[PDB]
């Protein structure tokens, strides 16, 4: 079946797979194949929505001294973009300390909380994201941030793309286009029950029905 046409493909890929298809198995197989094939210094990043899937993938992959990021997409920005390069973009007064109750309805008040209060902000409206817009803002203001992101990873694995806001799409597409980093997207179109958290199913469907540089496969197993 098509499960052998994926491991042999290197680049941008989609996998429109429904429930019970075995997304974890194919994701782990592709990750292991990519790591075994490549002999350079580059790494991979696997971004999920829950800590359970992150821990499952971490346990399945094993142990290595190569630095790969496995975790949630909220931890990705905090660990890679915001915490290291916040002061290089805005200034030395902006703090890199935070432990995240204090949600507001504006971006400027989010910056004010992060600075004066010294705690990561939030938004009251679930249709808009503070983390993934601040991350993209930092990426466009810091040259060393973009340099590190380009020098570090050669592929990023994304799963459950249907439950993604517009800010997540913006950041991922910025990475794909402006920084020339490959993407591996897996998602079920009919699993948008998380719409109560601001999920936008239109992004995955638009990618499926309009993308020209994406290779598309479907799994019925």
């Amino acid at each position: 079946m098509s499960r052998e046409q994926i491991i042999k493909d290197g680049g941008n890929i989609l996998v429109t797979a429904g429930a019970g298809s075995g997304k974890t198995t194919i994701l782990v197989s592709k990750i292991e194949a990519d790591l075994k094939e490549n002999k350079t210094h580059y790494s991979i990043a696997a971004v999920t929505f829950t800590n359970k899937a992150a821990k499952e993938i971490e346990g399945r992959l094993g142990y290595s001294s190569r630095g790969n990021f496995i975790g949630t997409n909220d931890g990705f920005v905090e660990s890679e973009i915001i915490r290291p390069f916040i002061k290089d973009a805005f200034g030395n007064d902006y703090p890199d300390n935070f432990t995240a109750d204090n949600q507001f309805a504006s971006y400027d008040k989010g910056l004010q909380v992060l600075k004066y209060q010294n705690i990561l902000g939030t938004y009251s409206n679930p249709k808009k994201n503070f983390k993934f817009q601040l991350a993209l803002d930092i990426l466009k203001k810091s040259l060393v941030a973009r340099q590190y992101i380009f020098s570090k990873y050669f592929k990023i694995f994304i799963d459950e793309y249907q439950d993604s806001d517009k800010d997540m799409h913006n950041l991922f597409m910025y990475l794909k286009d402006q920084l020339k980093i490959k993407l591996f997207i897996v998602g079920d179109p009919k699993q948008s029950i998380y719409i109560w958290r601001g999920a936008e199913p239109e992004n995955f469907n638009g990618l499926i029905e309009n993308s020209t540089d994406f290779n598309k496969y479907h799994l019925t197993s």
């Binding site: 002999k39 350079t40 210094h41 580059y42 790494s43 001294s65 890679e80 290291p84 390069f85 290089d88 810091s142 040259l143 060393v144 340099q147 590190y148 380009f150 020098s151 570090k152």
Partner: protein, 476 residues
Amino acid sequence: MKFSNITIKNFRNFEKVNINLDNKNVIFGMNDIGKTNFLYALRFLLDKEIRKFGFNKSDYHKHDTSKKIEIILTLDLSNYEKDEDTKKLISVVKGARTSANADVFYIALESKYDDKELYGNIILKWGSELDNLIDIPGRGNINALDNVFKVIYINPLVGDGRRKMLSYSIYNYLAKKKYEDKIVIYLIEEPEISLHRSMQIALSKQLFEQSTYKYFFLSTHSPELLYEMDNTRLIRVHSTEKVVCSSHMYNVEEAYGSVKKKLNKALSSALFAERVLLIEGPSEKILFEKVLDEVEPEYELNGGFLLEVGGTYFNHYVCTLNDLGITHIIKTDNDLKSKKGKKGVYELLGLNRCLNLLGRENLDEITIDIPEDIKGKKKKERLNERKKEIFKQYKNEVGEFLGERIYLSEIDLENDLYSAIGESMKRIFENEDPVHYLQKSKLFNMVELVNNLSTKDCFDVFEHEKFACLKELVGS
């Protein structure tokens, strides 16, 4: 992308030393203690198996453990776009860089002695700004800096030259496949211990014309290893008790392309000297060797050298020697070269070669009638009179030359030698004009002359004013 500089303070016999670097570096000199301590400092900074231990009381300068050891290395990150080693460095460093300083990086070492525990702890830092460095993170026995650099140390100790070459080959084709994800630096210490000459030349070609040795530091006592040198830093350690170092960025110009094998062979043996006298041909070699053997037999034991320059300009040799701190003396004579094509116009070759070493360059040409009737000795004396006039005209320039240790003859060396030993030359060259006869066969007649010179003639030549370069060579 590029190594730039290194600073060492209060470490062993180093007190405060600043050395400029490149990717390929060669260190040479007569100290032989600072040369090894240089590589030890490099190993301490970049080698985890050496840094794994601490610093003793003997590692501090003057054994005064109340001072701090600092070793700091500088890199250039200008070619991030075209280099993949810059990415290897940048992927482990994240946050220690700033955008205003995106092209320079620092790696530092610091040690302070503990008198109660009798231990010297080593702590590493990097940063883009030298006034704001932070500790390199790590867990357990491992460091974040150990993920980047792979230091390969080569030493013959701790026919058989073929076994050495096999060792070099296995090194070259092992460090490639296994370390495609690291930055590899080679430290080669005296590779000529029990090595045949041709094998030394082969290793020189490997070092300077193969891509397997992008970064290395080499210590050598042999000029055969330097037959192929190009695009390298030469670091010279001065022969004193206080460590003093001079460095030069060596290159060969595209103009000096067809004679590159002669420049390298000539200059390799002069790098291991203290004073060098630059001469033209083998006649001067014969004469000065005879005179020095008669007067100063041990001139070459004390660091003297005679260098044959040939048919080129002095810039290439003088730049290197001056930058390395070696004293250079030049003896030349006033030459007129007939221009290619038009007849009757000559070039002030000697004056031009002497001027180009003073920054001032080139001079206008001259024209001499030389009617077709005259020919032979008459033409020679006509040209000699013109040379005398030219020499008298530029007296101030000649006085400027003498201040730079440049000695230009009015006509030639034969006439200067006559002005000193004319009676002896008349005796030996019976029934001829000594200068004219000596100028017929330069090589055989010079041997005839030296075979009939006594100690009195040698001391007459040595003590003359026209031969003041020989006193400079032997240090008076």
